Each structure stands twice: as C-alpha cells, then as structure tokens.
C-alpha cells in the first residue's frame, strides 16, 4: 500500500521510498551509515545516507543542518550531487530520521593511492579536487575533513568531494574531530584555522598518492606532531610565538629536527616517467608539494595559488575554476547554539522544504 517501506541492514533499519531497492551497506559519514541502492524510477545506482534522530544533540543537529543546507546549495561537477531528500515520518511530532540520496561514484581514493598513476592522471585528480575546494571556499566554506575516503572517483577519471557535516567558516570560535593523519598543525596544536587548512589536507593526500601509504602516520593525537616535525623539521620561533603557552611549552620541548628536503621526502624513484610536455615533471610536483605541506598556515599556498601552480594549471579552465559561488542564505550561519527542540524544528522545516 504505502509510500515507504523497510529493510533491516544488520542492526540498522532503512525506511525509504519504494523507488530505492536492493540496499547494500557501503560506508559512513561523520554522521550516517550509507547504503548503495537501485533507484527503479531513474534506473541508476544511488547512495542513501541515513541520519538517525539527528536532533538528539547539539553536535548531530549542527552537522545535519549544514549537511542538509550545503548539499542543497552547492553546485559543481567536483562536489557530489544531491538527488533527493525525505523523511518517512508524517509530521514534526512523528519525526526522527533524515535520508539523503546522492550520486554513487565507483570508488573512493583508498584505492587509487595503491595503483601507480602517470603524471597526467595524478595531476588531473588534484586539479579536480582543487576546483571542488575552490567552489566551497568561494563561499567562505571550509571542508575541514578532506581525506582519501571523502574523495570519490569514477572510471572515466572524474572526481568529487563528499561529506559536508564538518564543513563551516573560519577557526576556534572541538579539537579531535578532523581525521588524525590529515590534521594540519593549526588543528593539532589548537590555534584555530582559515581556508588553507584544506590545503594541508590536499598536501597529505597528494603525498600519500605518491608515497603509497599515509604521509604522517602518527599513533595518537600527540605522536601525530612528531611525524610532522620528523619530516618537515621544527617550525620557526616566529611560528612558536603564535602558539598558546601551554602548548608552546611542549612544542619547544621536542627534540629539534632539521627535516628532510622534498627531493629526499619524495625522490624520483617514486614518481612515474616524466610526461610528454613541460610542466608535468616530478620536480614540479615537489615544488607544489613543498608549498602545500608547510607548517605555518601564513606561509602556505591557497587554492587559487594551487590552481595557478604550473603542475596543476595545465588543465586550468575558468568555467570549472571560477564558477559562481554556491549561494548561502545568510540565515544559516555554521555556529549558532539552538536547542533540543529549536533543532528538531529547523531540520524538519529544512527537510520539508527539500521534499
């Protein structure tokens, strides 16, 4: 009879439109288990992300709202596409679950990191990640959690970013929320953050792609800092000064480190043959690597700079790279405290709009 239905996936219940069929578990977001599904109507695979009673908490509601808002507003071929949203509940009183339907790519980067890319591919993927990020920044939005598993590819070599639950404007104003291995110094050390925090993440991702494995493993949130300095060497005192004193003391206390050169961090052995023409060179990759993986955010290259970089700009196209900003209605401001129930209200209104 009715519009929705139900399937047990392990201990999770998916209640979804009858159009969606054959659900399979695939992964998680900050919030959400996610299923792959057939959309019998549109006749294509999709991804359904269940957000479970997200109003149950400041956190969950904050993240859910953003994710709802940003997914509606964002539009770029390198951001993952909105397709549908719904709740199966029939009212603000009944309400508990949100569901988001998105396009399904073929794989996340996990994945590619292991295979051995030629330069044109490696540079192309980066270029696509960056246009994606420039799209968010373009509107003041920082992704904060870029990592191989938030970046999805397809076998035509296209690429999109994913999961906006973490996404907000600039820093300070909780610490262990961004994935450990991709944490920038400004995040490890508690000093707050600007858009180029995303650039640090890209640097790590690129590094891994080449490295074959995680660039700064780091066995806990503190060792993490060791890995960073073990490699890049001890930041400047100019830098340390901006460190809060409690943390400043620890840092200044570490064994000093010269740090390896990028040629040593990233030898030729590791790179493919150099490509047909000029800018896709192992050394150009190094140069770029060296401008992203910089401890001091104020000496770190931006997205627009990164797109300009000779290794990335060989694909440069203004209609991808200088699109119109997603438009955020000044209502939603990624920070406000609401309540227990002001939240349940907001999301509902927002899902309601979107159904």
């Amino acid at each position: 009879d009715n519009n929705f239905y139900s399937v047990e996936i392990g201990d999770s219940t998916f209640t979804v439109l009858k159009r969606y069929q054959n659900l399979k578990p695939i992964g998680s977001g900050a919030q959400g288990i996610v299923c792959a599904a057939y959309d019998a109507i549109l006749e294509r695979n999709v991804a359904i992300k269940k957000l479970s009673r997200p109003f149950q908490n400041q956190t969950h509601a904050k993240r859910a709202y953003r994710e709802l808002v940003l997914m509606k507003v964002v539009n770029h071929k390198n951001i993952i596409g909105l397709l549908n949203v719904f709740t199966p509940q029939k009212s603000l009183e009944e309400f508990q679950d949100v569901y988001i339907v998105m396009e399904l790519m073929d794989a996340n980067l996990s994945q590619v990191i292991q295979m051995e890319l030629d330069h044109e591919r490696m540079s192309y993927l980066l270029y696509q990640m960056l246009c994606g990020i420039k799209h968010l920044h373009s509107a003041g939005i920082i992704h904060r959690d870029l990592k191989p598993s938030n970046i999805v590819v397809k076998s035509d070599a296209t690429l999109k970013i994913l999961d906006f639950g973490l996404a907000r404007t600039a820093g300070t104003s909780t610490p262990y929320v961004v994935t450990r291995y991709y944490r920038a110094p400004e995040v490890i050390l508690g000093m707050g953050y600007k858009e180029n925090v995303d650039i640090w993440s890209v640097g790590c991702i690129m590094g891994e792609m080449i490295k074959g494995g995680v660039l700064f493993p780091g066995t806990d949130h503190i060792d993490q800092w060791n890995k960073v300095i073990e490699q890049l060497g001890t930041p400047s005192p100019e830098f340390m000064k901006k460190l809060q004193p409690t943390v400043r003391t620890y840092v200044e206390n570490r064994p000093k480190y010269a740090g390896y050169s990028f040629e040593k961090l990233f030898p030729d052995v590791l790179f493919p043959a150099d490509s047909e023409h000029n800018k896709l060179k192992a050394s150009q990759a190094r140069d770029l690597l060296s401008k992203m993986l910089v401890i001091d955010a104020s000496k770190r290259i931006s997205v627009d700079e990164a797109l300009q970089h000779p290794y990335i700009n060989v694909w440069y196209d203004p209609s991808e790279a200088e699109a119109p900003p997603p438009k955020i209605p000044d209502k939603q401001l990624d920070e406000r405290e609401h309540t227990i129930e002001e939240w349940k209200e907001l999301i509902y209104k927002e899902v309601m709009d979107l159904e």
Partner: peptide, 10 residues
Amino acid sequence: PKRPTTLNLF
C-alpha cells in the same frame, strides 16, 4: 595535454 578519460579500478 589531454585530460585522461579512463581510470582503472579493476
């Protein structure tokens, strides 16, 4: 320099 159009996820 052409954009690749294949990517092997075998």
